[PDB]
Amino acid sequence: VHYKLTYFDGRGAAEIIRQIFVLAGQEYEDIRLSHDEWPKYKNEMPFGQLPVLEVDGKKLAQSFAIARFVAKKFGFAGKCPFEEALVDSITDQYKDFINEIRPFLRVAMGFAEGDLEKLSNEVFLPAREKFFGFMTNFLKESKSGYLVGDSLTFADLYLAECASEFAKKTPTIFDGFPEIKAHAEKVRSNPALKKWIETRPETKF
Amino acid sequence: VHYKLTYFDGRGAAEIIRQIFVLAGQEYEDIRLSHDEWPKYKNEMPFGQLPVLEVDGKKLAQSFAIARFVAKKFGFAGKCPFEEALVDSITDQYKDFINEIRPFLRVAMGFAEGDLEKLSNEVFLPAREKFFGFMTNFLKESKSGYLVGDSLTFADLYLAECASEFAKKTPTIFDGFPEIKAHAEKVRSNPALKKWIETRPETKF
Ligand SMILES: N[C@@H](CCC(=O)N[C@@H](CS)C(=O)NCC(=O)O)C(=O)O
Numbered sequence: 001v002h003y004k005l006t007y008f009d010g011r012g013a014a015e016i017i018r019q020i021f022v023l024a025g026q027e028y029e030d031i032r033l034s035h036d037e038w039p040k041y042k043n044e045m046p047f048g049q050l051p052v053l054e055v056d057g058k059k060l061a062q063s064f065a066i067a068r069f070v071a072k073k074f075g076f077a078g079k080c081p082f083e084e085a086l087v088d089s090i091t092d093q094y095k096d097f098i099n100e101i102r103p104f105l106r107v108a109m110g111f112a113e114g115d116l117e118k119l120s121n122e123v124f125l126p127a128r129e130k131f132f133g134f135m136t137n138f139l140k141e142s143k144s145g146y147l148v149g150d151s152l153t154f155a156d157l158y159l160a161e162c163a164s165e166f167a168k169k170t171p172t173i174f175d176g177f178p179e180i181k182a183h184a185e186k187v188r189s190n191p192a193l194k195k196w197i198e199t200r201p202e203t204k205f
Numbered sequence: 206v207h208y209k210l211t212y213f214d215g216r217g218a219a220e221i222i223r224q225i226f227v228l229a230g231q232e233y234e235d236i237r238l239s240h241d242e243w244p245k246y247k248n249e250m251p252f253g254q255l256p257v258l259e260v261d262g263k264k265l266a267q268s269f270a271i272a273r274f275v276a277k278k279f280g281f282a283g284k285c286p287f288e289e290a291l292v293d294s295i296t297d298q299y300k301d302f303i304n305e306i307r308p309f310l311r312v313a314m315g316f317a318e319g320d321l322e323k324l325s326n327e328v329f330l331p332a333r334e335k336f337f338g339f340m341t342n343f344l345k346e347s348k349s350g351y352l353v354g355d356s357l358t359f360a361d362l363y364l365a366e367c368a369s370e371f372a373k374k375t376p377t378i379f380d381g382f383p384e385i386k387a388h389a390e391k392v393r394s395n396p397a398l399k400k401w402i403e404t405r406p407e408t409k410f
């Protein structure tokens with residue numbers, strides 16, 4: 001079975017898919033297209049966008065559909081049909097949270113001008129508060145330290161990566177959410193992830 | 206196994222989940238909360254929102270996670286692991302298309318004021334053009350008349366329902382997309398769906 005994953009040069013929407021391959025021990029081509037060459041390849045993608053996974057020559061788009069596909073192959077999608085659905089509900093909520101902080105992310109990423117501190121105070125931190133409060137109710141219920149069931153799933157991976165990364169410039173992101181901080185530390189102490197985080201290309205996004 | 210599905214009184218984000226139960230022959234409680242009672246129950250929902258499915262007393266949120274869960278129980282999620290992922294990629298694209306026409310949908314639904322005809326011309330129809338063009342490439346490749354594989358999946362259900370419903374007030378919605386029109390007719394000639402469409406509560410959204 002050969003895997004190719006195509007994205008731009010950044011962590012962005014592809015990074016959890018890479019971490020699932022990392023945890024599985026599975027080799028894949030990590031293809032990172034430059035801005036200049038993108039218009040030449042856009043046409044090969046099912047919805048003209050990235051990331052795209054190619055699985056023995058067959059193309060699959062949509063980062064959550066790809067993460068789910070790879071997680072199910074390697075045992076990170078949840079351990080029974082109901083737990084898989086809980087994992088899916090959590091990643092769908094995370095997608096809503098990402099959509100909600102769009103105005104913040106567009107300025108923080110240089111794609112628009114605006115008042116970064118104000119967007120942080122008014123858009124990002126209030127949105128993280130609601131999202132972290134729902135994630136914390138899951139962690140209070142699991143009592144394994146993982147969001148769903150007794151072991152790591154790709155829902156754990158989206159939450160820890162986003163919490164750890166936002167923590168770099170938003171120092172107060174864990175204030176009032178000590179379970180969220182413990183989960184991110186627990187997930188990132190996974191030895192395979194920890195080494196990938198040290199070794200991966202160092203990019204702004 | 207007992208199923209309860211809670212939504213507001215409308216088709217909205219719950220309707221495909223209802224149609225999956227319809228096709229399966231599976232009975233469920235179709236719970237429809239009024240606007241006035243909503244604040245009393247919001248707290249029982251995992252992310253304070255609807256729809257929510259309850260499966261022998263266990264709650265599951267997020268309309269696509271629920272549709273997937275029910276479709277997988279009843280055989281409408283795709284017939285092998287790769288086809289399931291294609292079905293997921295198509296419903297994720299549909300969610301992007303829905304997010305893109307938000308400005309149109311907010312005015313059309315009375316939740317905001319604005320120029321409905323202009324939003325239709327500038328936001329809705331250009332967005333449907335890109336989305337219908339990608340869906341048509343799938344239908345050209347399938348040659349069964351379904352989006353993925355040889356039989357109906359819940360990806361077919363989202364596309365046909367949204368195309369048929371928008372067609373009611375947007376008369377030109379099929380112009381230049383004869384495959385999309387044939388797919389919606391094919392899906393809605395399914396006898397179980399056709400009877401549900403006649404029998405379901407008649408609501409504005
Ligand atoms: N819902 C999609 C979103 C994909 C997406 O936003 N792709 C961007 C990544 S920057 C892209 O390819 N933009 C380039 C373009 O649209 O041409 C997913 O989760 O994969």
Ligand SMILES: N[C@@H](CCC(=O)N[C@@H](CS)C(=O)NCC(=O)O)C(=O)O
Pocket residue numbers: 092096213218247253254255256266267268269
């Ligand atoms: N991504 C969610 C969106 C759910 C959603 O938008 N729910 C609305 C339906 S009108 C809602 O419950 N609004 C009431 C509220 O937020 O209090 C899904 O697909 O289920």
